[PDB]
Amino acid sequence: SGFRKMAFPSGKVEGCMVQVTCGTTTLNGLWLDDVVYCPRHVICTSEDMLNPNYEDLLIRKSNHNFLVQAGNVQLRVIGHSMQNCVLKLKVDTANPKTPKYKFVRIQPGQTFSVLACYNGSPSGVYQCAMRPNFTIKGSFLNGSCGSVGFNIDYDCVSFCYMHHMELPTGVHAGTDLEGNFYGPFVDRQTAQAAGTDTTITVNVLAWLYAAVINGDRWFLNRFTTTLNDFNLVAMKYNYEPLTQDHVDILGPLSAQTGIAVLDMCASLKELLQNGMNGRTILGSALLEDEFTPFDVVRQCSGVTFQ
Amino acid sequence: SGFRKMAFPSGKVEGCMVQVTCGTTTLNGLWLDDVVYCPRHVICTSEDMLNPNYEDLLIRKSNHNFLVQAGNVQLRVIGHSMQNCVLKLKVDTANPKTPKYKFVRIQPGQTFSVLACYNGSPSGVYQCAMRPNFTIKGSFLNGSCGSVGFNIDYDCVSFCYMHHMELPTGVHAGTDLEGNFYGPFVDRQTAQAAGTDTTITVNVLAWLYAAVINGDRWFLNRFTTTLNDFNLVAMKYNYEPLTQDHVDILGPLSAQTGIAVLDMCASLKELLQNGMNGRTILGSALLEDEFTPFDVVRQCSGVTFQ
Ligand SMILES: *[C@](O)(C(N)=O)[C@H](CC1CCC1)NC(=O)[C@@H]1[C@@H]2[C@H](CN1C(=O)[C@@H](NC(=O)NC(C)(C)C)C(C)(C)C)C2(C)C
Ligand SMILES: *[C@](O)(C(N)=O)[C@H](CC1CCC1)NC(=O)[C@@H]1[C@@H]2[C@H](CN1C(=O)[C@@H](NC(=O)NC(C)(C)C)C(C)(C)C)C2(C)C
């Protein structure tokens, strides 16, 4: 038993990380087949960041200005192109460690693993949720740009995030692997706002299920609610509305525990209205929303990866 | 910026995980050079677990009764021996993915990464602290025995933990890689108690430093304390005593923030006596003790690994 926030094993992604240098800027790239993907602001000086014309800046660069290094070994750059907010560098060698992969656009409320890298060298791995306001709460210092997010389905790596920037209070923003930002952000050092965020209700319920599965059940009560009644409570507490689609997704956890989703909702309602009264659930004194239903099913059933 | 509980990249350890089967029991093994290490209770039936004589049980087994599989490929077992609570299976092939490694005995209050595996297949990675009572709070289902804990110093993997058993409330126990249990535990399904645990004070202070470094500073106050005065407070709250050795270890974080350790102690004292008043620190509503000083320095300075 036990329930922990868990990342995917990172080995398949470690084999794809490279260092990309353009002039004075060193950040990370992702090497898959004969292409290296990295944030396009690798081409910028500090002053360019304030108001960049990326088309004009990239015109000043040639293949030989992009220094790509895979471990100690230099890659030869034979082409370059900009796709949205990423740069793609064509190299003369296919990465012999290329895993089976896809590029996916993750939905708000879903999770992924981040392999934080510096100078093309993997530092550590952690899980993130894509917040409803299209930000993540990660750990990214200067040098981490180009670090990626991913999920692993058996042997296939689905890349979903590349790190670009930070917003006030350690809030992080980035792109899919086609260079499209999640959310309203642009890659310019100028005032920008993230939306109001909201709590991912289906994820809170999944985590309460995880708690019951792990024997932490003090918060279960004699009550029930309706979808409508729960949703009036969700709206007062800045929780996203619960839908029948979410009830259906919670089915495996309802079946494992025998606790109907609307009875677990009545527990959640009492925890929102009354607080935790100094008690903890799965070692937390707050209601946790960064575990998806799949995350709880996968962990509380033991799925693995080749 | 940002501060997250982060595991080491797991690729070097993924390349060492195998499946070990003896009769009806399948669990994980660790393949380094031409040896596979696994928990010795792989040899037990369910009934044997209740009161095993491991010497007598192992005598009934030959090399060809240990089925070792590395991916889809079978290893040949050419010798077996028991060392404390592990079995060592000599195989006829050195693991070609063997990293630079050491076996270390971790101290209480230190952290390590766990690569949770099932059937020899890596499932996920998370960080654990060795509690002062020589247990860990992990996520281990049936099939996870033999999963290991480790740290990475640049390119060298220091293995420190192998998973064996669970105690009430999802508390986990296991051995070093010489098969010596951490704590008082024995590998028998009979009543056993873990000691009273205590909170790792130096780790709480490191995490308050992490909070200040990340701009979360509402809990800083106009007060100071002494080592003696703080320690009377630590004892009332089941915190380990703070020593000058711990003050010295916190030096890099004191220097980064300009906040003397005894001034941060005065903040900790007020948080213990008054609680958090419904506020959070680095996204937590509890005081966190599973980050070492090195963990905070490494993350809040960006150290990486080859
Ligand atoms: C990466 O490029 C990298 N080299 O690692 C970097 C990570 C940050 C963490 C400190 C350096 N990303 C940026 O520097 C990024 C690039 C400029 C400025 N960036 C920011 O993240 C800035 N944020 C920002 O201006 N926020 C708003 C837009 C005002 C809310 C920093 C002030 C953190 C540097 C661009 C192109 C956005
Ligand atoms: C592993 O062997 C494995 N196959 O994965 C297993 C992990 C646990 C998680 C459920 C199965 N470890 C054990 O089964 C372990 C082996 C027997 C019994 N074990 C226990 O962990 C038991 N705990 C226990 O008896 N606790 C005390 C000692 C009474 C406090 C379980 C009841 C969880 C099975 C031995 C040799 C200790």
DSSP string, A4-63: ---BPP-HHHHTTEEEEEETTEEEEEEEETTEEEEEGGGG--TTGGGS--HHHHHHT--G
Residue B58 tokens read as: 């192992």
Give the three-class secondary structure for B88.
strand
Residue B213 tokens read as: 């470094």
Question: Closest residue of B to A215, CA-based?
Answer: B169
A78 part of contact set with chain B, CB < 8 Å? no
A222 part of contact set with chain B, CB < 8 Å? no
In angstroms, this model's resolution equals: 1.4
Q: Which residues of A touch B9 (CB under 8 A)?
A: 10-11, 14, 115, 122-125
The protein residue whose alpha carbon is closest to atom 18 in ligand 2 is: B189
B11-91: CATH number = 2.40.10.10
d(CA A14, CA B34): 25
CATH T-level topology, domain A201-300: main proteinase (3clpro) structure, domain 3 (1.10.1840)
B18: number of Cβ within 10 Å: 25
- Alpha-carbon distance A53 to nearest alpha carbon in chain B (angstroms): 27
A306 part of contact set with chain B, CB < 8 Å? yes
A228 part of contact set with chain B, CB < 8 Å? no
Residue A303's nearest CA partner among A12, A105, A9, A107 is A9
- Is the Cβ atom of A20 under 6 angstroms away from ligand 1? no
Q: Which residues of A touch B118 (CB under 8 A)?
A: 302, 304
- Is the Cβ atom of A26 under 6 angstroms away from ligand 1? no
- Is the Cβ atom of B46 under 6 angstroms away from ligand 2? no
Q: Which residues of A touch B11 (CB under 8 A)?
A: 9-12, 14-15, 122
d(CA A280, CA A258): 22
Residue type, A58: L
Question: Closest residue of B to A138, CA-based?
Answer: B2
Question: Which residue's structure tokens are 């962990």?
Answer: A299
d(CA A36, CA A20): 9
d(CA B208, CA B300): 13
d(CA A79, CA A70): 17
The CA-CA-CA angle for residues B161, B151, B74, to 5°, reads: 60
Catalytic residue among A41, A164, A172, A246: A41
Catalytic residue among A128, A145, A160, A265: A145
Upper half-sphere CA count for residue B270 (Cβ side, 13 Å): 15
B203: number of Cβ within 10 Å: 24
Phi, psi of A148 (to 5 degrees): -115, 160
B126 part of contact set with chain A, CB < 8 Å? yes
Instruction: Identify the H or E element spanning B17.
Output: strand B17-22
Question: Which residue's structure tokens are 């002062």?
Answer: B132
Please say whether the dihedral angle defined by the alpha carbons of residues B276, B278, B280 and B286, taken in this order, is positive or negative: positive
Known catalytic membership, residue A160: no
Please say whether the dihedral angle defined by the alpha carbons of residues A56, A62, A65 and A70, taken in this order, is positive or negative: positive
Phi, psi of A114 (to 5 degrees): -115, 130
Cβ of B125 within 8 Å of Cβ of A2? The answer is: no
The protein residue whose alpha carbon is closest to atom 15 in ligand 2 is: B165
Give the three-class secondary structure for A128.
strand
A10 part of contact set with chain B, CB < 8 Å? yes
The protein residue whose alpha carbon is closest to atom 33 in ligand 2 is: B166
Closest listed ligand to the CA of B163: 2
- Is the Cβ atom of B77 under 6 angstroms away from ligand 2? no
User: How does A258-279 read in b/e, with b if 16+ C-beta sit within 10 Å?
Assistant: ebebbbbbbbbbbbbeeeeeee
B141 part of contact set with chain A, CB < 8 Å? yes
Of B5, B119, B302, the CB nearest to A143: B302
Q: Which atom of ligand 2 is nearest to the CA of B167?
A: 30
Cβ of A137 within 8 Å of Cβ of B2? The answer is: yes
Cβ of A122 within 8 Å of Cβ of B304? The answer is: yes
Cα-based distances in Å from A208 to A202, A259, B5, B101: 10, 11, 21, 40
Q: Which atom of ligand 2 is nearest to the CA of B26?
A: 4
- Is the Cβ atom of A19 under 6 angstroms away from ligand 1? no
Contact A132, A240 (CB under 8 A): yes
Q: Which residues of A touch B165 (CB under 8 A)?
A: none
| Helices B261-274, B201-213: inter-axial angle, 10-degree rounding | 100
DSSP E strand boundaries for chain A: 17-22, 25-32, 35-39, 66-70, 73-75, 77-83, 86-91, 100-103, 111-118, 121-129, 148-153, 156-167, 171-175
d(CA B24, CA A111): 36
Give the three-class secondary structure for A257.
helix
- Alpha-carbon distance B125 to nearest alpha carbon in chain A (angstroms): 5
Residue B294's nearest CA partner among B8, B90, B21, B25 is B8
d(CA B248, CA B255): 11
Closest listed ligand to the CA of B47: 2
Which residues of B are part of the catalytic machinery? 41, 145
d(CA A76, CA B256): 40
Interface of A with B in 81-120 (CB under 8 A): 115-119
d(CA B73, CA B76): 10
Instruction: Identify the H or E element spanning A205.
Output: helix A201-213
Q: Which residues of A touch B28 (CB under 8 A)?
A: none
Question: Closest residue of A to B114, CA-based?
Answer: A6
Contact B115, A294 (CB under 8 A): no
B279 part of contact set with chain A, CB < 8 Å? no
Residue B235 tokens read as: 């004892």
d(CA B191, CA A240): 46
Phi, psi of B270 (to 5 degrees): -70, -35
d(CA B67, CA B73): 11
Please say whether the dihedral angle defined by the alpha carbons of residues B158, B163, B164 and B170, taken in this order, is positive or negative: positive
